[PDB]
Design a binder for these strands. Sequence first.
DNA 1: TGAGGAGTCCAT
DNA 2: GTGAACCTGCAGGTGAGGAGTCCATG
DNA 3: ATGGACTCCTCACCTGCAGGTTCAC
DNA 4: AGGTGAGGAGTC
Lengths: 229, 1134, 162, 54
Amino acid sequence: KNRIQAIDITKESYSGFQLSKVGILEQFMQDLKQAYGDSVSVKLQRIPGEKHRFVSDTIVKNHYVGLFDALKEHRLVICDLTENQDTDAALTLLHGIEHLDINAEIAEVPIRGALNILIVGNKDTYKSDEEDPYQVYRKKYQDTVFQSCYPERLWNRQGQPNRHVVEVLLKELLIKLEVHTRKHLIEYPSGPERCVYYMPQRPKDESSEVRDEPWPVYASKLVGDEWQY
Amino acid sequence: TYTALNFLLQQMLEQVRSELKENTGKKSKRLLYYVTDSVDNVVSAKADLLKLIEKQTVKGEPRFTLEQQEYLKAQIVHLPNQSEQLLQCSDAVLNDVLIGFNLNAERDVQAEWSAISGLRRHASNPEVKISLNRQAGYFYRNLIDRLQKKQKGADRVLLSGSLLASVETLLPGEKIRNGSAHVAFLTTSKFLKGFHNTRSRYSPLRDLSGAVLIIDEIDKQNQVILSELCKQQAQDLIWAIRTLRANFRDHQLESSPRYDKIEDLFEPLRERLEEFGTNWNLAFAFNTEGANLNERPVRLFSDRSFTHVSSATHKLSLKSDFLRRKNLIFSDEKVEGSLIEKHGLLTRFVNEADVIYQWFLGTMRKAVFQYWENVRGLEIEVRENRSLEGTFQEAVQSLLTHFNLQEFESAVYESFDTRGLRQSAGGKANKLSSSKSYHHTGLKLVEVAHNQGTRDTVNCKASFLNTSPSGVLADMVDAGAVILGISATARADTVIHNFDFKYLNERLGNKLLSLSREQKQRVNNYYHSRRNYKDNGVVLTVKYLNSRDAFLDALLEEYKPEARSSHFILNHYLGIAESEQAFVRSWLSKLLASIKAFISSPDNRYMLSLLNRTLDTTRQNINDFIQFCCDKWAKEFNVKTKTFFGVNADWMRLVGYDEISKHLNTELGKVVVFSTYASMGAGKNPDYAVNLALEGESLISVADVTYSTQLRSDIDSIYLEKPTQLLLSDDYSHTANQLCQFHQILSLQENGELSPKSAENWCRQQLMGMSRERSLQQYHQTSDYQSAVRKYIEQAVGRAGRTSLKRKQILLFVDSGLKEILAEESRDPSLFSHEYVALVNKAKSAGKSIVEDRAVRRLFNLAQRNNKDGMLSIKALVHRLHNQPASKSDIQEWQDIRTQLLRYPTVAFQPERFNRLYLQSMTKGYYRYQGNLDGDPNSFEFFDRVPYGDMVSEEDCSLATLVQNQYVRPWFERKGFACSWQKEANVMTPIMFTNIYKGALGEQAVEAVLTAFDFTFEEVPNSIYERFDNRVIFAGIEQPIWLDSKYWKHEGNESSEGYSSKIALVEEEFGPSKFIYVNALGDTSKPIRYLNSCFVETSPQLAKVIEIPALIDDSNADTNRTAVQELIKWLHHS
Amino acid sequence: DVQAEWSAISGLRRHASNPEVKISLNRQAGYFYRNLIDRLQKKQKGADRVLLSGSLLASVETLLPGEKIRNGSAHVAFLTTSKFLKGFHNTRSRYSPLRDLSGAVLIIDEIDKQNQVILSELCKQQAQDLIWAIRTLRANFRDHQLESSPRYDKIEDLFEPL
Amino acid sequence: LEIEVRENRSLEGTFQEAVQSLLTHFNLQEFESAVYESFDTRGLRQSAGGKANK
DNA sequence: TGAGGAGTCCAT
DNA sequence: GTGAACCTGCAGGTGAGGAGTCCATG
DNA sequence: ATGGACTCCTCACCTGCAGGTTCAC
DNA sequence: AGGTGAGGAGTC
């Protein structure tokens, strides 16, 4: 892939504004004039609008603080399942987690009944009948929330730890916990009632190239204070 | 040059004068040298010496006659390399030599000579020239080797007549051995290698007593020597030890009056070799065992004092399997903790192997000196004459043949003399009781890998640096040589681009001569006489140029008027991508802006631009642009211009440098030249002859007197950029570059520009693979960098101008990155040039800058370094004192430190021997710190940065009330034990004030109060040393009695298994024992504690250990006579 | 090393017309060949075995003809007696034809003079000091031992009487 | 036996490696040239009558 | 007193 | 009276960024 | 030798401080 | 097997 930026006003220069995807568009309208005169013109449309809500930065920050508070009162375990063990991925990830007042631990085998973040390898490498660590340690423990990551994504281009990945992993953990307990933990807004949610789901079989083949559809709804799946 | 060559001539005459006075004796001649770094300079200096001998007049009449001149010119010789030496001798000389030694019968020599001569006859094009050089070298080697062997002991052909002339032409170094000549001209690289005579190769660095050395460009040589020290060879440390251990068990020397006192020097080495065999099971091979250990090699780095770095993740271990019959390197338990290693360590093996290997190469030199002593005067049975330079190879081959060790011949030859030439200097010991410094210790790098072919064994390669360039320069002075170094920046304050003059002011002393203030003012007066600007009207104009983008924007548009934008023109028609755009804009703007000012001014003709990169064909696209601009600005004003691109060192010696002068004194116009900082460092004399018909009126002379010869002028406009990469790098190989980088890091840590924390981090990232850019970033945060930049600016302006004829307007344009650095100059402007003062003054007039003196930073860093070394060395010493057998050197070293601290707790001047025990504090008598003495040494902080920490001073040892006892004071006064702290700026480090001073202070106070009332003291029988203080005997008492001390009310958490283990070990061999635990300087009001074998206090009578609270109270230093009486009662019939 | 030495020889080959550059070139080429092939061999000695295919295969089969026997392209060789007693190089090592003779056909022409040629090869052999060798062997055999592994089975018992 | 990384399995392949192993475990390595120059001509002796002195 | 000269490979 | 939140819209971004040379080795 | 339509692929983001206003006690 | 969106390459 090769791409060109949309707009650029760096240092208020008119030469850099001429080399974008909205600078060429200005030239295009100046070439239809010098070959056709005013015979042909192109006019654009403005969508009507009266309700436009700018979002500040403080509201997002305060949202994420309360996001992490709920995750604080739980147990978090990190495990490593690579074949040729190397790198301090567990230590680095634990450092990143503990910078947010969330305290976790390191285990050699996953624990049952606690949130687990696992470190695994590339999926293609393991053989077909090889018992993938992830698949095995999932199917046996069927009442436990899981997460996984590759060890290469915790280091940036220059070698420093990547914070962003840590925040993403924690937020996703909370989302699955919310699904498992069937009751919301943080304050979401309210939505239309007496409605049912349906989602089609494509089969994961490689033979599922049929266009019209029927798909399973899954349904969710809310009764009382409990979601039903 | 005039002064130096005159200095040479005066000595040439003094030797003649001495020769005519002294038959009443007989001695040798004095050797005089003239060394530099370039071949051209050597040749030119020789030519000037001969010219001075010819054209020198006194009272308007020659000082010498024609016949006298020949004698003087017959004593100067020039020594080139071998390849050039062969290509000057003609066919007649070589044919005569070959016939004289009967080498024409052989087939190989004649065939080789035919090829050499045949190529010589058709050497016109630069294709057979390259081959001719390489073949000439090899032929020279073989011919000289055979000549030497034929002259060795027999069939020595007698040299006289034409044969002598032929040989001396082919071998100039012969003319010195017989005594014909005593003046030599040679380069630095050839001076460190030596030259050839008939007998053997002569090494100038092995005999320097009574020799005068003239070195030009003294500061540059620091680099040259370094490049020679990084080209050494590696060595396997397993093969060496197994080859030394096997050959030092049965082989013996001879009992003759020529081998006296040589068999007593190899005995300790023989003793240590066997111990290193039994401890590590050197009868088996080595191999690794485990994953992640067979994938990558293992690298270890040691500084031999305190800095150690490893390339692994967890500590590695060594084992010995008696069933598989092999030694295995295993990673052991990689989890956190879990039974810390009790098998062995790889690091210990490497470090101990090195000491033995260098212990064998230092004993041989001593042996050879002793051999010469016995063979010159105690035998004199066959006359051989000659000195230690002659009995060099015989004394080596004799010992090597006797000991069946013939593979170490080369390694002995590289570093050998009476003692050293590539091995340490100064104190010659790594211990607290010796002077320690980096410049005579070096560094070690070790790699472990698989052997070639075999898939079951591993080897350990090692590379070493044994001496810094400064140490070599100092040893030359201590040998007895006189060194005269001439330069303009010979005393800069840089340690990377110049020697370390602080190390040379502590080791040399009063042998480092210096000029006085009166002499400096005399030189200043001379300089102002020959160059006077406060008359005739000469002015210097300075301007600083910033970056201008609007200036370049319009110019690019005019260059290609049919384009659209500026970035597109720069990217497309010129050849730079988007990454390299800001930097390009930056320099080009300033360059063109300076050129405009040059062209506008009427009375200027010549301009030189100094950049950091070559403007050659590779940058053709940019060149055209610049050219175009000039033409436009030539039409705006009224003057014609000419430009010269591609000025390289290759261009200088292929096209020449005399064309600019021709174009200047034959045609009118202006000239612009493009050059770099390094290119205009090997091409000198940038002068052009003048012609007043072409020039105008601005050639005012500045000399107070008239000037001779032709009329010449110089540069009148200069552009200065800011220098580029200033960190040294090698190109010989990979290991050479690594050694270079480690050398520089350790040098900066030595002087005081870097803290131990930063230095260790930098070393670690060097080991794991590092980019150049990060290294330069680390370099730029030090004060050495600014000194280097200033040095280059000074040199650049100094070389621009060599005549007494100047214009009335001299223009200097400077980049806008040098302003702050130049404003920071604070030295004495007594011997400065004229342009440099203008630069400094112009920069200094803008605002003001807070200056944090380098001294203040240096004190903090050096305090940290000394404190860091103390801890590690003490731990190593005590651990070596807990081995089952205790040695004798160790107990001596243990005694000396305490005795020295007690006698001199605070010195005044700079200590020389015990140097890493004293730190310099800003206040005089006390200092405050805060840290932990059982954790990370790189966490300490001192002085004002910690105003609430612990204090090191005289009041915290209670020495006032310590010596106020009546039975303690006489003992202190007799043995010269100071009872006060002289207020000077040297106190002991916080490691030697809590674990050394405190103990030894109270321990000997025990030996006064106990000894006055009977009791007798003794010494530990070499088996329980440092586990107990002393042994006491009184009135014939059985069950030998041991004691121990803890100075004041100091408590230690060893009441657990440690104390019980001590008691158990003592009693298991010596039998029943009694123990006296006592303190001092405490509260003498507590009862006596009679502890049993454990800490379950039993009845008074059935006890084994007595604990006394105190004997001398801190109130007014009384004596607890009740405690002494009870102690006598318990240790009696009972 | 390689670029400088190769540039020298490459330049000198062009002017190879006079009967003086011939003598120098003949000796220089022999030295260059040894170093180049030695570097090739140690590069492919295990470790990073660079594969050969297409252009590279053809070039290496032009510089090392003895390689064509190893892979299985050719099985008929023409050579002289002196080169037969020493061997020819392949990409991996030096192949001595006097160690694998099982089968094979050897046509020798002028069988009488071969006697003299072989004798010459026997005479040009280096000497050996005896005192040094005996002392070395005596010292190193006193305590050194091999490994105890299946690949080293019944080898130690061959050295006991010595 | 001893399945491992396999290649041409004959005298040629095992020669150099065996010599280096046996000459690394016993120290030595100063005899490499002699052993290499004797395994070509003299290497075909010990035939119980073709090479025996008694 | 005894006999009487050229011709060759290959790695250093 | 004041000092904690609270609320726009102008800057600046990984490090820093190259020639030139002596001598021995088959 | 041609054109315009679905499906699968890769790549970037996830600011920061300084100056004027304002309550909250 | 971080995520959600916005978007450039390879073919019936």
